[PDB]
Amino acid sequence: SNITYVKGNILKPKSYARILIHSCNCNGSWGGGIAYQLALRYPKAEKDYVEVCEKYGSNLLGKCILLPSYENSDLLICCLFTSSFGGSSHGEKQSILNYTKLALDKLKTFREAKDSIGDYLNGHIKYPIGEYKLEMPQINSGIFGVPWKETERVLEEFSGDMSFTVYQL
């Protein structure tokens, strides 16, 4: 299994380069959950996220955008665009699952290329890309109501390609 589970806050500051993967809406709202915490401590990353939502809207579904944290060069933010709207206006379960697989497949290809998705990055990537650990919360399982085992089966389709550390409550 390519998933490592840990109990704790993914946002607790860590000693190592890491890409923080989280599930996003196209509406320019980091309005809740981990996205809200990201909005409050990395406000320049939010501005990038909102701008790309402004530019493309729901043309982003199934795509991925890599953002520097700006305030910590060891930390990149990876937005999986899986829903048009956030909160209780989120998209249907299967669409979120499918879009999650699609955005993660763009990130997989981007990682192999370097060993739209990287345009805000150029110059904030200090280390080689294969050295950023891939970390995420239990994406889609809270506000979107997407059962974790269904999302786990999606992350499992990348065994060999990619390894993830998943933070849980």
The structure was resolved to a resolution in Å of 2.4
Query: Which method, experimentally, gave rise to this model?
Result: X-ray
Q: Is 23 annotated as a binding residue?
A: yes
Structure tokens at 73: 């060069």
Structural domain spans, the chain: 1-169
Structure tokens at 130: 């294969």
CA–CA separation, 65 vs 76, rounded Å?
10
Return left, alpha or beta for 8; rule: phi > 0 is left, psi -120 to 50 is alpha, else beta: left
Cα-flanking dihedrals φ and ψ of residue 95, to 5°?
-65, -40
CA–CA separation, 19 vs 17, rounded Å?
7
Q: Is 144 annotated as a binding residue?
A: yes
Q: Is 24 annotated as a binding residue?
A: yes
Beta-bridged to residue 66, according to DSSP, are 78
* Residue pair 106/64 in contact by the 8 Å Cβ criterion: yes
Q: Is 140 annotated as a binding residue?
A: yes
Q: Which of 87, 68, 57 is nearest to 20 (CA)?
A: 68
Q: Is 86 annotated as a binding residue?
A: no
Cα-flanking dihedrals φ and ψ of residue 142, to 5°?
-90, -95
Q: Which of 35, 17, 8, 128 is nearest to 72 (CA)?
A: 17
CA–CA separation, 126 vs 2, rounded Å?
25
